[PDB]
């Protein structure tokens, strides 16, 4: 509705869910879409496919924003982390620079115990 012609694509590929938020280079959320919020839940929403079917739905918003091309901001493991890209890259959206913003602490915080079964 403002025609930005281009922005950036954020992907929060978590181990349980994946979400894609397209925003102008400034960092202002233009349009977002999440796997879970796309029907399938639990086991199904945490699959690679889920990210794709969900991601494509994000473009269904940030596209009518004049957007032509965009970058890639991937962080965290889990599926879709790679899938999400192809969706956009193939959704006509001209790609450009793929970057892995995945955080990596040089040893600072102590992770939680948990997981013990």
């Amino acid at each position: 509705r403002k025609q930005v012609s281009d922005g950036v694509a954020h992907i929060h590929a978590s181990f349980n869910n994946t979400i894609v938020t397209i925003t102008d280079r400034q960092g202002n959320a233009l349009g977002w879409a999440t796997a879970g919020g796309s029907g399938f839940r639990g086991s199904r929403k945490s699959t690679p496919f889920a990210a794709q079917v969900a991601a494509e739905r994000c473009a269904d918003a940030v596209k009518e924003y004049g957007i032509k091309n965009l970058e890639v901001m991937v962080k965290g493991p889990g599926p879709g982390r790679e899938s999400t890209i192809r969706a956009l890259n193939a959704a006509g959206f001209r790609i450009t620079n793929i970057t892995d913003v995945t955080p990596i602490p040089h040893n600072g915080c102590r992770p939680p115990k948990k997981r013990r079964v």
């Binding site: 965290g76 493991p77 790609i95 620079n97 970057t99 995945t102 990596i104 948990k114």
Partner: protein, 51 residues
């Protein structure tokens, strides 16, 4: 990691990503530390590396 390609051919080149960061330095920290497991469990790798 940073990656920019010239000419639209659609190639991820996800190499530079997993060629260092990604999992490992992540999957390792995904859950509670080791505290003891490193000075031992981790040092038992040679028990396999030696042969």
């Amino acid at each position: 990691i940073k990656v920019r390609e010239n000419e639209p051919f659609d190639v991820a080149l996800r190499r530079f990503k997993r060629s260092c960061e990604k999992a490992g330095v992540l999957a390792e920290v995904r859950r509670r530390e080791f505290y003891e497991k490193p000075t031992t469990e981790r040092k038992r790798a040679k028990a396999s590396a030696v042969k």
